[PDB]
Write an enzyme that holds these catalytic residues in place. Structure first.
Site, PDB file in Angstrom:
ATOM      1  N   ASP A 176       0.844  -1.195   0.000  1.00  9.57           N
ATOM      2  CA  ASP A 176       0.000   0.000   0.000  1.00  9.57           C
ATOM      3  C   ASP A 176       0.876   1.240   0.000  1.00  9.57           C
ATOM      4  OD1 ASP A 176      -3.315  -0.091   1.103  1.00  9.57           O
ATOM      5  OD2 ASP A 176      -2.315   1.826   0.882  1.00  9.57           O
TER       6      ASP A 176
ATOM      7  N   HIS B 162      -3.900   6.023   3.485  1.00  6.17           N
ATOM      8  CA  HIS B 162      -4.545   4.740   3.205  1.00  6.17           C
ATOM      9  C   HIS B 162      -3.823   3.558   3.834  1.00  6.17           C
ATOM     10  CE1 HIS B 162      -5.793   1.305   0.509  1.00  6.17           C
ATOM     11  NE2 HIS B 162      -6.957   1.936   0.561  1.00  6.17           N
TER      12      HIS B 162
ATOM     13  N   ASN C 258     -13.860  -0.687  -6.539  1.00  7.16           N
ATOM     14  CA  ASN C 258     -14.983   0.173  -6.208  1.00  7.16           C
ATOM     15  C   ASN C 258     -15.679   0.737  -7.454  1.00  7.16           C
ATOM     16  OD1 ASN C 258     -14.129   0.026  -3.397  1.00  7.16           O
ATOM     17  ND2 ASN C 258     -13.021   1.950  -3.644  1.00  7.16           N
TER      18      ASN C 258
ATOM     19  N   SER D 251     -11.325  -1.201  -0.150  1.00  5.28           N
ATOM     20  CA  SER D 251     -10.027  -1.193   0.516  1.00  5.28           C
ATOM     21  C   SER D 251     -10.106  -1.310   2.036  1.00  5.28           C
ATOM     22  CB  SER D 251      -9.290   0.104   0.159  1.00  5.28           C
ATOM     23  OG  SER D 251      -8.625  -0.114  -1.082  1.00  5.28           O
TER      24      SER D 251
END
Ligand SMILES: [Ca+2]
Ligand SMILES: [Ca+2]
Length: 276
Positions: free
Chosen positions: A39, A70, A157, A222
């Protein structure tokens, strides 16, 4: 041990049915299992981690620390003492995205290959990212799972069929869609037959990178994915010899079924359950 009150996503996964109990019970903590968060990095000094977060690799010339938020957020849902499923795991930052959360696929693959060759069992990798079809990324994730690492990856998404995305479409990875606290598919969540199960992914609170105490509430597949990574770590603590195939099978067979609404054609009606 039981945590009460608790973040709704933790709250939801230790029971089969609504209403929420405002409590999260856990009989394991993931102690001794290694979780690789691929990430934007991790703010390792955040108070949620109590020294358990460290940097493994940085594909962009930096020091592995998060400048986006994130990666820290994701890490917290997996293993933060307040926001986390598995409150004693070892966390490793594998930083492949920049402060803006962008990065080439090549760098993503570099971090996947690093995990393949450098992980220690028992090991779990979290990929809360996705993009168009990429056979080279698919192959690098398949090779990593064959090497013995359990992968949980976001379905994406796009409100679309997850089979059209990488690495969501990898059959051997656990592919995770997002639900809301009303047990419905979140309106953005990818769905269909390449999705293996769903987990809470709307209004999920966790740690953030701007300070050692900062937090943020986010929406996305996520955010669903690290719940599943956390449960894999719970299982591996008690079964450290298990192969990725067996871990996936325990979680899917143990999943709550039939409770979700609006999940879409081809989707399995399976919701993460932590008490395996
Ligand atoms: Ca509960
Ligand atoms: Ca899959």
């Amino acid at each position: 041990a039981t945590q009460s009150p608790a973040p709704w996503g933790l709250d939801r996964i230790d029971q089969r049915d609504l209403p929420l109990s405002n409590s999260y019970t856990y009989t394991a903590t993931g102690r001794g299992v290694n979780v690789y968060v691929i990430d934007t990095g991790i703010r390792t000094t955040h108070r949620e981690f109590g020294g358990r977060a460290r940097v493994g690799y940085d594909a962009l010339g930096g020091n592995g620390q998060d400048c986006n938020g994130h990666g820290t957020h994701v890490a917290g849902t997996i293993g933060g003492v307040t926001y986390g499923v598995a409150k004693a795991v070892n966390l490793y930052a594998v930083r492949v995205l920049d402060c803006n959360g962008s990065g080439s696929t090549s760098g993503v693959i570099a971090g996947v290959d690093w995990v393949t060759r450098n992980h220690r069992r028992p090991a779990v990798a979290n990929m809360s990212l996705g993009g168009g079809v990429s056979t080279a990324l698919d192959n690098a994730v398949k090779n990593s799972i064959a090497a013995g690492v359990v992968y949980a990856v976001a379905a994406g998404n796009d409100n679309a069929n997850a089979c059209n995305y990488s690495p969501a479409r990898v059959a051997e990875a656990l592919t995770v869609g997002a639900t809301t606290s009303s047990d419905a598919r979140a309106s953005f969540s990818n769905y269909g037959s390449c999705v293996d199960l769903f987990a809470p992914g709307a209004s999920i609170p966790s740690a953030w990178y701007t300070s050692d105490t900062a937090t943020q509430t986010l929406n996305g597949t996520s955010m669903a994915t690290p719940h599943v990574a956390g449960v894999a770590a719970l299982y591996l603590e008690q079964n450290p010899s298990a192969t990725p195939a067996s871990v996936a099978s325990a979680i899917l067979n143990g999943a709550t079924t039939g409770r979700l609404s609006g999940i879409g054609s081809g989707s399995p009606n399976r919701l993460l359950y932590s008490l395996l």
